[PDB]
Design a protein around this motif. Structure first.
Motif, PDB file in Angstrom:
ATOM      1  N   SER A 142      21.740  19.690  38.297  1.00  0.00           N
ATOM      2  CA  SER A 142      23.098  20.225  38.572  1.00  0.00           C
ATOM      3  C   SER A 142      24.062  19.062  38.818  1.00  0.00           C
ATOM      4  O   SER A 142      25.200  19.135  38.331  1.00  0.00           O
ATOM      5  CB  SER A 142      23.090  21.173  39.728  1.00  0.00           C
ATOM      6  N   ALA A 143      23.620  18.032  39.538  1.00  0.00           N
ATOM      7  CA  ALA A 143      24.459  16.858  39.767  1.00  0.00           C
ATOM      8  C   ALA A 143      24.733  16.109  38.470  1.00  0.00           C
ATOM      9  O   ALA A 143      25.867  15.683  38.216  1.00  0.00           O
ATOM     10  CB  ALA A 143      23.797  15.934  40.787  1.00  0.00           C
ATOM     11  N   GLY A 144      23.705  15.934  37.638  1.00  0.00           N
ATOM     12  CA  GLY A 144      23.905  15.254  36.369  1.00  0.00           C
ATOM     13  C   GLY A 144      24.856  15.996  35.454  1.00  0.00           C
ATOM     14  O   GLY A 144      25.668  15.384  34.757  1.00  0.00           O
ATOM     15  N   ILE A 145      24.764  17.325  35.436  1.00  0.00           N
ATOM     16  CA  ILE A 145      25.677  18.120  34.625  1.00  0.00           C
ATOM     17  C   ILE A 145      27.090  18.048  35.188  1.00  0.00           C
ATOM     18  O   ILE A 145      28.071  17.995  34.437  1.00  0.00           O
ATOM     19  CB  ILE A 145      25.165  19.568  34.521  1.00  0.00           C
ATOM     20  N   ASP A 146      27.219  18.028  36.518  1.00  0.00           N
ATOM     21  CA  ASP A 146      28.537  17.902  37.129  1.00  0.00           C
ATOM     22  C   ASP A 146      29.175  16.558  36.810  1.00  0.00           C
ATOM     23  O   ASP A 146      30.402  16.467  36.697  1.00  0.00           O
ATOM     24  CB  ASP A 146      28.436  18.095  38.641  1.00  0.00           C
ATOM     25  N   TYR A 147      28.370  15.508  36.670  1.00  0.00           N
ATOM     26  CA  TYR A 147      28.899  14.200  36.305  1.00  0.00           C
ATOM     27  C   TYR A 147      28.973  13.976  34.801  1.00  0.00           C
ATOM     28  O   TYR A 147      29.540  12.966  34.372  1.00  0.00           O
ATOM     29  CB  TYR A 147      28.057  13.093  36.948  1.00  0.00           C
ATOM     30  N   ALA A 148      28.428  14.883  33.996  1.00  0.00           N
ATOM     31  CA  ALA A 148      28.497  14.735  32.549  1.00  0.00           C
ATOM     32  C   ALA A 148      29.894  15.067  32.044  1.00  0.00           C
ATOM     33  O   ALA A 148      30.546  15.994  32.533  1.00  0.00           O
ATOM     34  CB  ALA A 148      27.467  15.635  31.871  1.00  0.00           C
ATOM     35  N   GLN A 149      30.356  14.301  31.058  1.00  0.00           N
ATOM     36  CA  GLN A 149      31.679  14.491  30.486  1.00  0.00           C
ATOM     37  C   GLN A 149      31.659  14.768  28.991  1.00  0.00           C
ATOM     38  O   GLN A 149      32.731  14.856  28.381  1.00  0.00           O
ATOM     39  CB  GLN A 149      32.557  13.263  30.760  1.00  0.00           C
ATOM     40  N   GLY A 150      30.483  14.905  28.382  1.00  0.00           N
ATOM     41  CA  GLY A 150      30.415  15.180  26.964  1.00  0.00           C
ATOM     42  C   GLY A 150      30.757  16.617  26.627  1.00  0.00           C
ATOM     43  O   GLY A 150      30.760  17.504  27.476  1.00  0.00           O
ATOM     44  N   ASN A 151      31.052  16.842  25.344  1.00  0.00           N
ATOM     45  CA  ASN A 151      31.369  18.190  24.886  1.00  0.00           C
ATOM     46  C   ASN A 151      30.142  19.091  24.938  1.00  0.00           C
ATOM     47  O   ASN A 151      30.255  20.288  25.227  1.00  0.00           O
ATOM     48  CB  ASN A 151      31.944  18.143  23.471  1.00  0.00           C
ATOM     49  N   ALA A 152      28.967  18.538  24.658  1.00  0.00           N
ATOM     50  CA  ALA A 152      27.708  19.264  24.743  1.00  0.00           C
ATOM     51  C   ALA A 152      26.764  18.508  25.664  1.00  0.00           C
ATOM     52  O   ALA A 152      26.585  17.296  25.514  1.00  0.00           O
ATOM     53  CB  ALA A 152      27.077  19.442  23.363  1.00  0.00           C
ATOM     54  N   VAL A 153      26.159  19.226  26.605  1.00  0.00           N
ATOM     55  CA  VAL A 153      25.266  18.648  27.602  1.00  0.00           C
ATOM     56  C   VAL A 153      23.848  19.118  27.315  1.00  0.00           C
ATOM     57  O   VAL A 153      23.598  20.323  27.194  1.00  0.00           O
ATOM     58  CB  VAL A 153      25.696  19.031  29.028  1.00  0.00           C
ATOM     59  N   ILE A 154      22.926  18.171  27.204  1.00  0.00           N
ATOM     60  CA  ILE A 154      21.520  18.444  26.946  1.00  0.00           C
ATOM     61  C   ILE A 154      20.707  17.927  28.125  1.00  0.00           C
ATOM     62  O   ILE A 154      20.510  16.721  28.277  1.00  0.00           O
ATOM     63  CB  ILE A 154      21.049  17.794  25.633  1.00  0.00           C
ATOM     64  N   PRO A 155      20.246  18.807  29.007  1.00  0.00           N
ATOM     65  CA  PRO A 155      19.216  18.401  29.965  1.00  0.00           C
ATOM     66  C   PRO A 155      17.916  18.084  29.246  1.00  0.00           C
ATOM     67  O   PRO A 155      17.583  18.689  28.225  1.00  0.00           O
ATOM     68  CB  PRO A 155      19.068  19.628  30.871  1.00  0.00           C
ATOM     69  N   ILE A 156      17.175  17.118  29.786  1.00  0.00           N
ATOM     70  CA  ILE A 156      15.908  16.704  29.193  1.00  0.00           C
ATOM     71  C   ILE A 156      15.045  16.096  30.286  1.00  0.00           C
ATOM     72  O   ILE A 156      15.547  15.639  31.313  1.00  0.00           O
ATOM     73  CB  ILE A 156      16.131  15.713  28.022  1.00  0.00           C
TER      74      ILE A 156
END
Ligand SMILES: O=c1ccn([C@@H]2O[C@H](COP(=O)(O)OP(=O)(O)O[C@H]3O[C@H](CO)[C@@H](O)[C@H](O)[C@H]3O)[C@@H](O)[C@H]2O)c(=O)[nH]1
Ligand SMILES: O=c1ccn([C@@H]2O[C@H](COP(=O)(O)OP(=O)(O)O[C@H]3O[C@H](CO)[C@@H](O)[C@H](O)[C@H]3O)[C@@H](O)[C@H]2O)c(=O)[nH]1
Ligand SMILES: O=c1ccn([C@@H]2O[C@H](COP(=O)(O)OP(=O)(O)O[C@H]3O[C@H](CO)[C@@H](O)[C@H](O)[C@H]3O)[C@@H](O)[C@H]2O)c(=O)[nH]1
Ligand SMILES: O=c1ccn([C@@H]2O[C@H](COP(=O)(O)OP(=O)(O)O)[C@@H](O)[C@H]2O)c(=O)[nH]1
Ligand SMILES: [Mg+2]
Ligand SMILES: [Mg+2]
Ligand SMILES: [Mg+2]
Ligand SMILES: [Mg+2]
Lengths: 306, 305, 312, 305
Positions: free
Chosen positions: B78-92
């Motif tokens: 959740s923290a990584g997604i909150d700090y992500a700024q790309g148009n598409a977010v891929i958790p891995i």
């Protein structure tokens, strides 16, 4: 800037102003750092604010926070930390029971690369068995509650970095257990062993224990509704056994054995209801504390979110 | 502008950093799209933070989010997604159990116009039958809990569009069931089947309890319904016993007022519990503070702030 | 500026779009006011969004709010009202159940100084006995809950002034009973009567389970009266148990213990049940307080000011 | 800079506006300070709004807050205080039971240094036994819950400093018991005695319960304690029956395990209700959102946003 912020909650603390300030200036000038003394007057009834005003006149480092009412030591401390602007904030006591000469040492541990530096007493120092065993039991319970294992014999004398202070201010909670919240942030923590100089009922204590148990974690609410739901199932069970023992094994016993089944069934059902309610209540609790999901220590390549 | 954001929750992930970064770079090079890799260190005791620092000093696409302590894979994601700024977010995952090459397919699906692209296991092979039954039953229960039918055999390996990420960030819930939450944000969702290359049982219970209770009121609505039914039956049978004592004067045992009192008090307390549960469910729904709606597109209007 | 907004929730309304828009342009044009038509596509699975795009591209008064999922008619209406910038907002159904011509009369009432104008149906004429009586009972009960006594035979077809729309937007509650909410925000309110056309007076199967769900939502999501009638009817039971448990105690002490070997059972049952009922009542009162706090409605709603500026 | 804000909530206060304003002017002009009257029309079903409008047109010092409907006297007072911009706020009644001359005295006490100056009637006089004794008992019960001992025979005639007004506006409670709220925000309070010059159950009971419950957790904390002692006694006494039934058998007729089941299940349910009540009180404290502290004065520091 302000490097250190000594926060002193004060209530009926006159006749201690001169000695405390003398000790603080004695220990804070060798550090050669820009400091500040946030004194939080917690609605003292005596002439404490007058002497605090005189001291603030004389010295440009004392800053007074005058609370409207006597909120308490914890709330006055919270106000002081909120109004403190130093990189490190040290809550200290106005009665000088905890020595101020250790502030120096605390600062050193803060410069080793730590964020929280507790000041832990050598050993109870007084407080007969009646207290040492109770403190031990409470500490074991809370240590099982949290996943960070705050050190034993911790009080309100400590050093917090600006990250720790900002994280604490990031928790919008009215039901606060300070030890549990300080553990719940989990930065690079440590503790300094200090020995108190050779110089409370179970009504003010039991209330504090209940506040720590209930206002920090759901563990009392999870252990319960798990003990219930062990019974209730054990009551719905054996209630069915009684149904299948009257249906087979004709009821030659007293004529109203079915009452037992009722006493079980409804009771068990009621317990299930309570359990469900408790579960949801716990969820609502987590929702109303509004704790942040995560805390960020350092960032590399990213600016901090607003 | 960053097009893709690969979010990796790291915890004691040393002896995996070089290989994971090599595979990720190899997969992401042919894309020819500006990408970023956000590594969320979850308070690891292990030395993965130092090697993360080394890679960030070497590779400029590495951005590290250092959490204060160990919060768990869910919160780190959740923290990584909150700090992500790309148009598409891929958790891995850092263990590379989920093949990073599937990212190819994922972004391809994202190019077709799918806001969420799950990555689901083609099959679990000849796995344990106990899991084959329990996971299936839990998935069926959750699918009955929602009205969107999230695909089964799905983990955290997904592609989320920026609109879906923003919608998820609009949910201020502190009690989160991410599967049900992703179902709740019902954008254009699809799945890609992948085959993996050749358990605590306490976390498996706590996560199931969260899924049951931390998402919806359906368990609390089927109860206070069954409880109310049982209470009404108890009241009806207590009334019948009152009438039975009143007419026919039944007194054989000579104390048939214990059972009437038991049934009446149990039914009254059960109705009270049902009303309290209904109002507590309303309180839970109101404190979760979910947005009423979610706008996926607008024509002629500008988005409200 | 935009004088009027027409908010139309939409779900699989393909083949209804042309006639609905034709009637809307038929009625709205003679009003000679600036109007917008906010079409809230509530996750339709049919070809509704495509025809909406065509109409929006060809007609400048159509705006589209595409919802990600199918949130329901009420939430679609909430989204449309949130995106409506007209001084008056008129919800209307895309199936032409409510004649859009009546919109005209609504606007007239709006110019008379009324902040809410309802569209009330004169008679049901499609519900033989059970639905009309149940609706009368439900409306009486909810009116006992509410203050302004919202008129009956009314639906979502209405008109709200910008003040009323802003006041409704001032309630950040998720469990909403909009029928009671429009009465809680009392403003100059009125209602105009209209008759549904004979083409659309059919049986309209009344899913009784959805009817029950709406009834439960309205009863348990607008006020605390279900939680206040109980905690009173339960506290009375608890008091009448503690009493007569005491009476059994004094009778056993005075009139002997002729009981077969019980009345410790009955006294225990009565005492424990009454104590638990008091506990449940206190929990209910504090849960009602928590519910009122959590809803977070504004304390008051200012309609007009004189000599003062509005509070931000 | 307005030095004084009079707040008059009016509901059907026709034929009394001219007298009220004449008395208010005769009281306020000798004060020689800039005053400001705010008339909160609480949805009057009368022609008082027209008279208020004419008075506002004729006289500059009068301003009007028109509420959407009739909300109540407390809500009207809150609305008027919210719109009051004076250094001191004096809630007064349009009926003029409270003598406006006391405003003078109130202002005087405000200049002595006090932040809240209550206007307390010396004695009820007319009320002989029931009303005065029940008011005394209500105040005595409330006092333990409150932190600061409020003065007796108080009403809504008072002077509140801008500091106190801001502190009160900092409490976003929807369930408000103003008598206890003014005690919680303790400051330099006082009172000024005066004479008012020569009871349905659906209000004097509803308000009493609202003050008892919607202000403090004391009713909930006194119970869940007594209930916990009752639960502990039930469990201990059930254990006593168990130990009595395993020793010397069961000389009582052989159906005395019913008592054990009743006592055990009642005690377990009472413990469950006690835990639920404790956590409900915690949730109540969390959701009331009262500020932790209140700052009256600062020296060397600037007030936080
Ligand atoms: O506290 C943390 C923080 C982050 N991560 C990250 O989460 C990723 C994937 O999680 P991981 O634990 O490595 O997945 P598995 O171990 O392959 O399988 C899990 O999935 C099982 C399903 O039941 C669970 O029993 C266990 O959590 C676990 O075995 C990894 O990159 C980790 O770095 C953790 O695992 N734990
Ligand atoms: O999820 C949604 C979102 C929007 N709309 C729109 O709502 C408008 C009208 O709503 P509708 O429910 O069809 O009103 P009625 O047809 O007059 O009456 C219905 O009202 C009941 C609600 O309880 C429905 O169950 C029944 O189909 C029917 O009697 C239409 O433009 C639809 O497009 C829906 O119907 N469902
Ligand atoms: O719903 C409302 C809204 C506003 N006001 C205003 O409140 C002011 C004073 O109200 P008032 O009724 O005179 O308060 P009290 O002086 O305390 O007298 C009342 O006190 C009790 C009501 O609280 C009743 O038992 C009494 O009959 C009644 O005289 C006036 O400007 C009114 O216009 C009301 O009274 N009722
Ligand atoms: O209501 C209050 C507010 C503040 N303090 C301050 O709390 C510190 C420690 O005092 P305490 O009486 O708590 O001694 P302890 O319990 O730590 O032995 C001192 O700085 C006091 O000034 C207090 O004692 N009571
Ligand atoms: Mg001390
Ligand atoms: Mg793994
Ligand atoms: Mg229809
Ligand atoms: Mg009066």
């Amino acid at each position: 800037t302000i490097e250190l912020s000594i926060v002193i909650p004060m209530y009926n603390e006159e006749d201690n102003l001169e000695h405390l300030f003398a000790r603080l200036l004695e220990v804070l000038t060798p550090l050669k750092i820009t400091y500040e003394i946030i004194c939080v007057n917690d609605g003292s009834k005596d002439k404490t604010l007058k002497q605090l005003i005189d001291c603030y006149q004389s010295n440009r480092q004392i800053k007074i926070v005058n609370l409207s009412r006597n909120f308490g030591k914890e709330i006055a401390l919270s106000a002081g930390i909120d109004y403190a602007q130093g990189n490190a904030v040290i809550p200290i006591d106005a009665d000088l029971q905890d020595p101020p000469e250790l502030i120096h040492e605390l600062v050193d541990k803060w410069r080793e690369g730590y964020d929280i530096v507790y000041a832990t007493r050598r050993s109870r120092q007084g407080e007969t068995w009646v207290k040492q065993f109770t403190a031990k039991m409470f500490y074991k319970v809370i240590g099982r509650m949290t996943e960070i294992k705050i050190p034993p014999n911790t009080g309100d004398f400590r050093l917090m970095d600006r990250k720790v202070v900002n994280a604490i201010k990031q928790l919008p909670e009215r039901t606060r257990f300070m030890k549990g919240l300080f553990a719940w942030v989990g930065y690079r923590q440590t503790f300094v062993l200090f020995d108190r100089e050779p110089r409370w009922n179970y009504w003010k204590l039991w209330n504090f224990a209940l506040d720590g148990i209930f206002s920090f974690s759901l563990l009392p609410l999870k252990v319960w509704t798990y003990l219930g739901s062990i019974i209730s199932l054990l009551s719905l069970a054996y209630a069915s056994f009684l149904i299948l023992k009257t249906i087979t094994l004709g009821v030659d016993v007293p004529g109203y054995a079915s009452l037992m089944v009722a006493i079980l069934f409804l009771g068990g059902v009621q317990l299930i209801s309570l359990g469900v309610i408790g579960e949801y209540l716990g969820r609502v609790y987590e929702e109303v504390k509004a704790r942040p999901l995560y805390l960020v220590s350092d960032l590399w390549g990213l600016e901090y979110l607003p």
